[PDB]
Paper text:
RAS proteins cycle between inactive GDP-bound and active GTP-bound states. Mutations in RAS and PI3Kα are major drivers of human cancer. Their interaction plays a crucial role in activating PI3Kα and amplifying the PI3K-AKT-mTOR pathway. Active RAS interaction with p110α, along with phosphorylated receptor tyrosine kinases (RTK) interaction with p85, activates PI3Kα, allowing it to modify its lipid substrate, phosphatidylinositol-4,5-bisphosphate (PIP2), to phosphatidylinositol 3,4,5-trisphosphate (PIP3). Here, we present structures of KRAS, RRAS2, and MRAS bound to the catalytic subunit (p110α) of PI3Kα, elucidating the interaction interfaces and local conformational changes upon complex formation.
To determine if p110α and RAS undergo conformational changes upon complex formation, we conducted comparative structural analyses using the structure of p110α and RAS GTPases in their uncomplexed states.
Numbering used by the authors: 12 to 179
């Protein structure tokens, strides 16, 4: 009888939807269809403790920036996603962290930094050490993922739940 409202945020095209669809439906989307805001649910067992995960897949497009206050108010944990092949998305993810903490009026709040598209090994603009450094700056953990090859997809969501449980 436990549930978590998880929210996937980050800049446009970094793979928020591809990660979420791989997690929910176990298939990889090739087309890039920009999201306004989509919702999904999954029943999981994390550390032998069952939990329903209600996932909000949000807009990376600035056009829909005004919807952030609403979803940031109600989110219980956030996956901060950037693409390792897009340095702009890497430099911009801190803006999402700042807005979450401003809406929560808190110095810390459950989050994890995800460097997606790690399968694009020959196209990287951000090294693994750079992502780990940014995570330390933001006081969160770092995980690299690939929606394409389904690397660390379930793990990213499970780990966010673990972080949320430690904040309680
Ligand atoms: N090689 C590779 N491509 C990926 C990966 N994740 C997403 N992509 C791709 O990158 C594009 C955008 O992915 P998408 O999930 O729609 O990104 P998004 O962050 O939801 N975009 P938006 O903010 O506009 O909703 C796609 O064409 C998709 O196939 C990945 O892990 N590896
Ligand atoms: Mg999307």
């Amino acid at each position: 009888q436990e549930k978590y409202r998880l929210v996937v945020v980050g800049g446009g095209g970094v793979g928020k939807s591809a990660l979420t669809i791989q997690f929910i439906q176990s298939y990889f989307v090739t087309d890039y269809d920009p999201t306004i805001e989509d919702s999904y649910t999954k029943q999981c067992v994390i550390d032998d403790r069952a939990a329903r995960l209600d996932i909000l897949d949000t807009a990376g497009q600035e056009e829909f920036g005004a919807m952030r206050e609403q979803y940031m108010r109600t989110g219980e944990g956030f996956l901060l996603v950037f693409s390792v092949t897009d340095r702009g998305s890497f430099e911009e993810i801190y803006k999402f962290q700042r807005q979450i903490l401003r809406v929560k009026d808190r110095d810390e709040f459950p989050m994890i930094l995800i460097g997606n598209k790690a399968d694009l090994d020959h196209q990287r603009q951000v090294t693994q050490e750079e992502g780990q450094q940014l995570a330390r700056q933001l006081k969160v953990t770092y995980m690299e993922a690939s929606a394409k090859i389904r690397m660390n997809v379930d793990q990213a969501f499970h780990e966010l739940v673990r972080v949320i449980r430690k904040f309680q």
